Design a protein around this ligand. Structure first.
Ligand SMILES: C=C1C[C@]23C[C@H]1CC[C@H]2[C@@]12CC[C@H](O)[C@@](C)(C(=O)O1)[C@H]2[C@@H]3C(=O)O
Lengths: 217, 213
């Protein structure tokens, strides 16, 4: 098959700045008819791919002129001038000159903004859950920047990793922020066995870790 | 151009499934259509294409198992899948080969329909409330299978300040949380409720967030 590579895999640009994504083809994408069917899709968080540019440089009249495509043969580039928040997401290049039709892994586009502290909130198990014999303690690390962050749980002062599930969201396009949730699940039996429960987050914006906790007692 | 996929679901290995793609906004019969799936690793992989005159073609990884087809009268693209295998699970989209009189290239993509091939059995979710200038509340949707699940607040009203995280798998059950932030005065003054829908198990669950005692 025809392998489609992309570069870079990640990218964080400041608004009003220009972003440049490259796509490398294992074979010339020039069709015997002379056309070059290489295209660029953009899949915004939680959405499906949108055709941005096709046949190397044609703008799928949907998107603006700040989106431009170029290249030839096996090398192609996409540039986004005066970047906007709505631009964040995953950019994919694709080829239709050859069957099977293939896509590249994509390139993530992040927006560069001012560091922002997380708004962590801890939530004791819910009354309904405990009746089921289960106990989950949730913690939210909302709207922070950069994406880099660390979460640490401690039961009565001791770090716990078993029964700790984590999830991160994509960069938000309304504020260029990031959010994370963490859940420490354990049986009611063990839950009612401890007094202190804590969620500890280490982030760039603060020297000492942002700690939130509560006591079952 | 409107493409809406449907029929996604959970099938056991070796099982079969029939996906549909309803089309509107363009002369469906004068376009080749295709199916592309996005893997959990998020890779897009073409899976089938049908021609205007009915010619059909696919990649070897799928030959003898999938069959594209079209119902021009009903304006529907179809995808019949047999001998499904665990590595088949993915989000399936129908795409249109839009460059009318000039070679293959995908125009529009549909909303996508989710399909999980696994031995794990579908399980309803348990929806627990998460209550404590700005206040944050949440909901814990836990122990369900398979994906997906929709979470809305106040029947869709509260949009801003919402964080529905991606569900995580710890066994054969998923679990996800969704948070919502509102002005302190907003609650418990006004009610805040999370509505959770799990099509697989045919289950809807509303949970009004009340103060804890
Ligand atoms: C093997 C095929 C299938 C083709 C012709 C040829 C190459 C490109 C395809 C399309 C792609 C674009 C149009 O939908 C189409 C109607 C067209 O003009 O070209 C398609 C046609 C078909 O399905 O009958």
């Amino acid at each position: 098959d025809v392998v489609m590579t992309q570069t870079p895999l990640s990218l964080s640009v400041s608004l009003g700045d220009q972003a440049s994504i490259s796509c490398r083809s294992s074979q010339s994408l020039v069709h015997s008819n002379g056309n070059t069917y290489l295209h660029w899709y953009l899949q915004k968080p939680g959405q499906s791919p949108k055709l941005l540019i096709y046949k190397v440089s044609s703008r799928f009249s949907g998107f603006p002129d700040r989106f431009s495509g170029s290249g030839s043969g096996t090398d192609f580039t996409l540039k986004i001038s005066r970047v906007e928040a709505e631009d964040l997401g995953v950019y994919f290049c694709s080829q239709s000159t050859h069957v099977p039709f293939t896509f590249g892994s994509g390139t993530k586009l992040e927006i560069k903004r001012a560091d922002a502290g997380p708004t962590v909130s801890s939530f004791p198990p819910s009354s309904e859950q405990l009746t089921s014999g289960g106990a989950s303690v949730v913690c939210f690390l909302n709207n922070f920047y950069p994406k880099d962050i660390n979460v640490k749980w401690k039961i009565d002062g001791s770090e716990r990793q078993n029964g700790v599930l984590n999830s991160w969201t994509d960069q938000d396009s309304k504020d260029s922020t990031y959010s994370m949730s963490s859940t420490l699940t354990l049986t009611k039996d063990e839950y009612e066995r401890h007094a202190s429960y804590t969620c500890e987050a280490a982030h760039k914006t603060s020297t000492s870790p942002i700690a939130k906790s509560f006591n079952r007692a | 151009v409107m493409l809406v996929e449907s029929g996604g679901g959970l099938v056991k290995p070796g099982g079969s499934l029939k996906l549909s793609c309803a089309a509107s906004g363009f002369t469906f019969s004068s376009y080749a259509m295709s199916w592309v799936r996005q893997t959990p690793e998020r890779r897009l992989e073409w899976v089938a294409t049908i021609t205007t005159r009915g010619y059909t073609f696919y990649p070897d990884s799928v030959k003898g198992r999938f069959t594209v087809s079209r119902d021009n009268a009903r304006n529907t693209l179809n995808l019949q899948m047999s001998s499904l295998r665990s590595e088949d699970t993915a989000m399936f989209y129908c795409t249109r080969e839009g460059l009318l009189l000039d070679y293959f290239t995908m125009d529009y993509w549909g909303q996508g329909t989710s399909v999980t091939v696994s031995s794990a059995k579908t399980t309803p979710p348990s929806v627990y409330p998460l209550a404590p200038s700005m206040v944050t509340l949440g909901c814990l949707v836990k122990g369900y299978f398979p994906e997906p699940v929709t979470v809305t607040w106040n029947s869709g009203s509260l949009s801003s300040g919402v964080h529905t995280f991606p569900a995580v798998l710890q066994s054969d059950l998923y679990t996800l949380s969704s948070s919502v932030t509102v002005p302190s005065s907003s609650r418990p003054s006004e009610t805040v409720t999370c509505n959770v829908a799990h099509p697989a198990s045919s289950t809807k669950v509303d949970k009004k967030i009340v103060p804890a005692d």
